[PDB]
Each structure stands twice: as C-alpha cells, then as structure tokens.
Design a protein around this motif. Structure first.
Motif, PDB file in Angstrom:
ATOM      1  N   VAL A 220       3.669   5.701  -6.304  1.00 44.71           N
ATOM      2  CA  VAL A 220       2.883   5.725  -7.575  1.00 44.71           C
ATOM      3  C   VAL A 220       2.124   6.667  -8.036  1.00 44.71           C
ATOM      4  O   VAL A 220       1.682   7.359  -8.857  1.00 44.71           O
ATOM      5  CB  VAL A 220       2.911   3.800  -7.853  1.00 44.71           C
ATOM      6  CG1 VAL A 220       2.114   3.933  -9.539  1.00 44.71           C
ATOM      7  CG2 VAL A 220       4.289   3.270  -8.168  1.00 44.71           C
ATOM      8  N   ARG A 221       1.235   6.937  -7.056  1.00 40.25           N
ATOM      9  CA  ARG A 221      -0.459   6.982  -7.879  1.00 40.25           C
ATOM     10  C   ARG A 221       0.520   8.785  -7.820  1.00 40.25           C
ATOM     11  O   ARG A 221       0.237   9.447  -8.211  1.00 40.25           O
ATOM     12  CB  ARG A 221      -0.494   7.487  -6.825  1.00 40.25           C
ATOM     13  CG  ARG A 221      -0.243   6.922  -4.949  1.00 40.25           C
ATOM     14  CD  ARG A 221      -1.075   8.370  -3.939  1.00 40.25           C
ATOM     15  NE  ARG A 221      -0.343   9.432  -3.840  1.00 40.25           N
ATOM     16  CZ  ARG A 221       0.036   9.632  -2.668  1.00 40.25           C
ATOM     17  NH1 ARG A 221      -0.506   9.346  -1.585  1.00 40.25           N
ATOM     18  NH2 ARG A 221       1.555  10.776  -2.166  1.00 40.25           N
ATOM     19  N   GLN A 222       1.307   9.246  -6.699  1.00 39.86           N
ATOM     20  CA  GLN A 222       1.953  10.293  -7.004  1.00 39.86           C
ATOM     21  C   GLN A 222       2.843  10.642  -8.192  1.00 39.86           C
ATOM     22  O   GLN A 222       2.957  11.978  -8.630  1.00 39.86           O
ATOM     23  CB  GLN A 222       3.151  10.485  -5.509  1.00 39.86           C
ATOM     24  CG  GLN A 222       3.378  12.281  -5.801  1.00 39.86           C
ATOM     25  CD  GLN A 222       4.303  12.973  -4.028  1.00 39.86           C
ATOM     26  OE1 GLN A 222       4.817  12.011  -3.506  1.00 39.86           O
ATOM     27  NE2 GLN A 222       4.572  13.835  -4.246  1.00 39.86           N
TER      28      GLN A 222
ATOM     29  N   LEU B  50      -0.543  11.890 -15.805  1.00 39.47           N
ATOM     30  CA  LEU B  50      -1.647  11.300 -16.591  1.00 39.47           C
ATOM     31  C   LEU B  50      -2.719  10.440 -15.788  1.00 39.47           C
ATOM     32  O   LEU B  50      -2.913   8.947 -15.507  1.00 39.47           O
ATOM     33  CB  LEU B  50      -0.080   9.906 -16.848  1.00 39.47           C
ATOM     34  CG  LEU B  50       0.361  10.051 -17.550  1.00 39.47           C
ATOM     35  CD1 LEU B  50       1.844   9.772 -18.055  1.00 39.47           C
ATOM     36  CD2 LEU B  50      -1.005  10.407 -19.154  1.00 39.47           C
ATOM     37  N   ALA B  51      -2.768  10.760 -14.315  1.00 38.55           N
ATOM     38  CA  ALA B  51      -3.644  10.174 -13.487  1.00 38.55           C
ATOM     39  C   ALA B  51      -4.519  10.171 -13.570  1.00 38.55           C
ATOM     40  O   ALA B  51      -5.193  10.840 -14.676  1.00 38.55           O
ATOM     41  CB  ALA B  51      -3.230  10.938 -11.971  1.00 38.55           C
ATOM     42  N   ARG B  52      -5.076   8.582 -13.610  1.00 34.95           N
ATOM     43  CA  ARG B  52      -6.745   8.090 -13.378  1.00 34.95           C
ATOM     44  C   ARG B  52      -6.450   7.586 -15.345  1.00 34.95           C
ATOM     45  O   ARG B  52      -7.705   7.184 -15.785  1.00 34.95           O
ATOM     46  CB  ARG B  52      -7.669   9.386 -13.348  1.00 34.95           C
ATOM     47  CG  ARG B  52      -8.024   9.087 -11.827  1.00 34.95           C
ATOM     48  CD  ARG B  52      -8.350  10.424 -11.218  1.00 34.95           C
ATOM     49  NE  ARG B  52      -8.659  11.074 -12.021  1.00 34.95           N
ATOM     50  CZ  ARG B  52      -7.358  11.928 -11.710  1.00 34.95           C
ATOM     51  NH1 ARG B  52      -6.733  12.691 -10.675  1.00 34.95           N
ATOM     52  NH2 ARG B  52      -7.497  13.483 -12.288  1.00 34.95           N
TER      53      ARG B  52
ATOM     54  N   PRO C 181       0.671  -1.401   0.492  1.00 34.49           N
ATOM     55  CA  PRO C 181       0.151  -0.323  -0.100  1.00 34.49           C
ATOM     56  C   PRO C 181       0.991   1.296  -0.057  1.00 34.49           C
ATOM     57  O   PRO C 181       0.474   2.570  -0.629  1.00 34.49           O
ATOM     58  CB  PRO C 181      -0.835   0.150   1.183  1.00 34.49           C
ATOM     59  CG  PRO C 181      -0.354  -1.525   1.265  1.00 34.49           C
ATOM     60  CD  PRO C 181       0.593  -2.348   1.259  1.00 34.49           C
ATOM     61  N   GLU C 182       2.125   1.678   0.915  1.00 37.70           N
ATOM     62  CA  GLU C 182       2.527   2.910   0.253  1.00 37.70           C
ATOM     63  C   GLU C 182       3.604   2.421  -0.448  1.00 37.70           C
ATOM     64  O   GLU C 182       4.133   3.356  -0.818  1.00 37.70           O
ATOM     65  CB  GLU C 182       4.096   1.654   1.923  1.00 37.70           C
ATOM     66  CG  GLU C 182       3.251   1.973   3.455  1.00 37.70           C
ATOM     67  CD  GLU C 182       2.654   0.421   3.759  1.00 37.70           C
ATOM     68  OE1 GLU C 182       3.500  -0.818   2.487  1.00 37.70           O
ATOM     69  OE2 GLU C 182       2.691   0.191   4.508  1.00 37.70           O
TER      70      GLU C 182
END
Ligand SMILES: CC1=C(/C=C/C(C)=C/C=C/C(C)=C/C(=O)Nc2ccc(O)cc2)C(C)(C)CCC1
Length: 174
Positions: free
Chosen positions: A152-154, A161-163, A146-147
């Motif tokens: 990676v989400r950041q 390119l998020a989402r 999860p960490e």
C-alpha cells in the motif's frame, strides 16, 4: 522520473466487481478540498444481476456548524472502457448531504485483504491532479500485516499521494 499525470496511473487489472462486494473498512485517507467524511467510515459494495455496482457508506460528518452527525450515503457506479475505472453518482439519505458525481478508480486490491481507491475531481492544465481523494480500505478492522502495508505504501507513492494520508478512527459512533 515517475509521472504524476492522472492518465498515467495504473489501475487494477481485470477488476472483478463480484469478488469486490462486501464490507470494506476505511483505515486511512487523503481528503479532497472541502466537505468530506470524517471518521468511522465503512462501505458496503453490491453487484446486481446486470453486472451493475452500487454502494452505501457510513461515516461521521462534522457540520460546518460543528454538528456531529452520521451520514448514510448512496452511490451507483457506471462502467467505463476500463474495468477498474467507474463514474460514481452519490447522494445522502438526508437532503443536506452532498450530492455529486466522481470518477471512482480501483488502484489495487487483493479482494481479500485490502483496497486502494482514488478520485481526481479536478485536473490541472498539466494533467496532474489538483483536488483529489483516496481511500485505503481493509476487509478486517484490525488491519494488514506488515507486508500488505509495504504494498500500500508503494501504490500511494505511485499516485503521488505518499505522506498525505491520515489514520482513520473507528469507535462505533455511527
Ligand atoms: C458513497 C460512497 C463513496 C463516496 C462517498 C462520499 C465521497 C461522501 C461524501 C460525503 C460528504 C462530503 C458529506 C458532507 O457533505 N459533510 C458535511 C459537512 C458539513 C455540513 O454542514 C454538511 C455536510 C465511497 C468513495 C466512500 C465508496 C462508495 C460509496
């Protein structure tokens, strides 16, 4: 506030090609325009004595004719003044596979758990990217905790390119 100009994107500081070798599994991806790799994608990175870098990739491809096949691709990378940004020449074992040359940037990586890659094939007049591709790779096909996910989400958000990535499946096809 946060810029989407490719030139302002951060890349992996003091990128080390040798700790980067080995098997990388694709877990997620944002595709570019046109023909690409579908799923079941795995890459293998190598480095020779001259400090080069090459790689081979495998994945399932759906031909425009709806042919289900498995591409064996090859790529040779050329170094630049930035240890994390390469010029990648690639081709397939079968002639019908796409041949080309793409920028290959290493956004972030811990060499041990994950990697974030990116290529902009076309720049808009504003410096932002018009046609891009990005891979989220894992050392282990079971993922990241999860960490690592949060990190990676950041970077994704940082690449503007998020989402836009989809989960990639692995089922033993190729
Ligand atoms: C080498 C490899 C890289 C890039 C590979 C690319 C980006 C492959 C593209 C292949 C395609 C796009 C094949 C295709 O050309 N697919 C079709 C579909 C339909 C058809 O009729 C013919 C071909 C990368 C980043 C993974 C890791 C470094 C090694």
């Amino acid at each position: 506030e946060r810029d989407c100009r490719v030139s302002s994107f951060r890349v992996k500081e003091n990128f080390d090609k040798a700790r980067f070798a080995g098997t990388w599994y694709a877990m997620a991806k944002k595709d570019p325009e046109g023909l690409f790799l579908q799923d079941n994608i795995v890459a293998e990175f190598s480095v020779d004595e001259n400090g080069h870098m090459s790689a081979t990739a495998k994945g399932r491809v759906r031909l425009l004719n709806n042919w289900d096949v498995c591409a064996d691709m090859v790529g040779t990378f050329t170094d630049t003044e930035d240890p994390a940004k390469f010029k990648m020449k690639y081709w397939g074992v079968a002639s019908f596979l796409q041949k080309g040359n793409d920028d290959h940037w290493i956004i972030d990586t811990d060499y041990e758990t994950f990697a974030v890659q990116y290529s902009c094939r076309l720049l808009n007049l504003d410096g932002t990217c018009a046609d891009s591709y990005s891979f989220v790779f894992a050392r282990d096909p079971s993922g990241f905790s999860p960490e690592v996910q949060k990190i990676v989400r950041q970077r994704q958000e940082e690449l503007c390119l998020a989402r836009q990535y989809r989960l990639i499946p692995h089922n033993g096809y190729c």
